[PDB]
Amino acid sequence: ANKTVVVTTILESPYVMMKKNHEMLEGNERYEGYCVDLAAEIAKHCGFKYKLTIVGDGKYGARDADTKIWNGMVGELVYGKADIAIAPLTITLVREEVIDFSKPFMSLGISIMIKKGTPIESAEDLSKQTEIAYGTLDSGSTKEFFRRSKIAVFDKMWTYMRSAEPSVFVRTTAEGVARVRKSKGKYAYLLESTMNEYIEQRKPCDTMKVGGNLDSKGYGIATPKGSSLGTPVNLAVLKLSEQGVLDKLKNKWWYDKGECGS
Numbered sequence: 001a002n003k004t005v006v007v008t009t010i011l012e013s014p015y016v017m018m019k020k021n022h023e024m025l026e027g028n029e030r031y032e033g034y035c036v037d038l039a040a041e042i043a044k045h046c047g048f049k050y051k052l053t054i055v056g057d058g059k060y061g062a063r064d065a066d067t068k069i070w071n072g073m074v075g076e077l078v079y080g081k082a083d084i085a086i087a088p089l090t091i092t093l094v095r096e097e098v099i100d101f102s103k104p105f106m107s108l109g110i111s112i113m114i115k116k117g118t119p120i121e122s123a124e125d126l127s128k129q130t131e132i133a134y135g136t137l138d139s140g141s142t143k144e145f146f147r148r149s150k151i152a153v154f155d156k157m158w159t160y161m162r163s164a165e166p167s168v169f170v171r172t173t174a175e176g177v178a179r180v181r182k183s184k185g186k187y188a189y190l191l192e193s194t195m196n197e198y199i200e201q202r203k204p205c206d207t208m209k210v211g212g213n214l215d216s217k218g219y220g221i222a223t224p225k226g227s228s229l230g231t232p233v234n235l236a237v238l239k240l241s242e243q244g245v246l247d248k249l250k251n252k253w254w255y256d257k258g259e260c261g262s
């Protein structure tokens with residue numbers, strides 16, 4: 001018999017956040033956000049009951065080089081702790097080797113966030129100077145993009161980033177944004193275009209996404225290999241795409257209540 005599906009997700013705005021009064025609420029109603037709405041829609045279309053759970057270690061999915069153990073949401077799928085991950089989980093080769101990804105439900109690319117007024121318009125711009133420091137998260141797909149790259153500009157940027165003092169890496173999105181804002185234009189934060197756009201729409205409206213994206217990829221819903229859930233989840237993403245629901249949800253959580261005008 002079918003079971004209540006365990007959905008692993010993560011606290012990251014505007015994808016998932018706890019409602020302000022979550023202590024007096026229970027279960028799935030404790031949370032709100034893009035991925036909460038998406039989870040609800042996927043569950044509706046696939047006809048399953050589910051329980052939203054926040055990933056234990058608060059990570060996305062990387063494999064320890066020594067222990068070979070997978071962490072984060074990917075880890076929870078791999079080790080049978082959860083049935084599906086619904087989050088801004090970037091589709092990458094190393095992850096798709098061990099879990100199944102649906103077709104992407106949101107597009108994004110690595111992008112540059114600057115404090116307004118920063119004389120930077122592209123990654124090449126960053127790569128040609130040191131006055132304005134720049135960095136990525138200390139773990140995740142962006143950092144890996146830089147570590148792995150064979151492209152000259154990106155390789156130059158990685159070389160700079162790994163040796164820059166003090167460390168140009170940050171541990172959370174909030175930290176990157178905060179560093180940008182506090183640095184009077186002396187720090188630029190490399191982050192997924194989706195988060196960049198989100199933050200750009202929030203007071204005090206002092207950040208800006210600049211330039212084209214450095215790459216082009218997507219977020220996908222993840223399930224363990226051979227899961228019975230994989231096919232219907234994928235078909236559900238397809239259907240929600242074609243009926244305009246994904247566009248509607250992104251507008252809902254990104255732009256509808258934007259605080260920085262039009």
Ligand SMILES: CC(C)S(=O)(=O)NC[C@H](C)c1ccc(-c2ccc([C@@H](C)CNS(=O)(=O)C(C)C)cc2)cc1
Nearest residue numbers: 091092103104105106107108216217218237238241
């Ligand atoms: C990791 C990469 C291989 S990738 O991200 O999968 N594709 C690379 C290529 C540049 C690319 C990157 C992103 C997208 C893209 C296009 C659309 C979407 C959403 C809106 C819908 N995805 S869908 O499968 O086309 C749809 C019919 C449900 C999400 C991602 C399409 C192609």
Ligand SMILES: C=C(C)[C@H]1CN[C@H](C(=O)O)[C@H]1CC(=O)O
Nearest residue numbers: 060088089090140141142191192
């Ligand atoms: C927010 C985090 C740490 C996640 C979100 N997507 C990327 C991932 O799935 O690895 C990470 C962001 C990044 O690497 O810039």
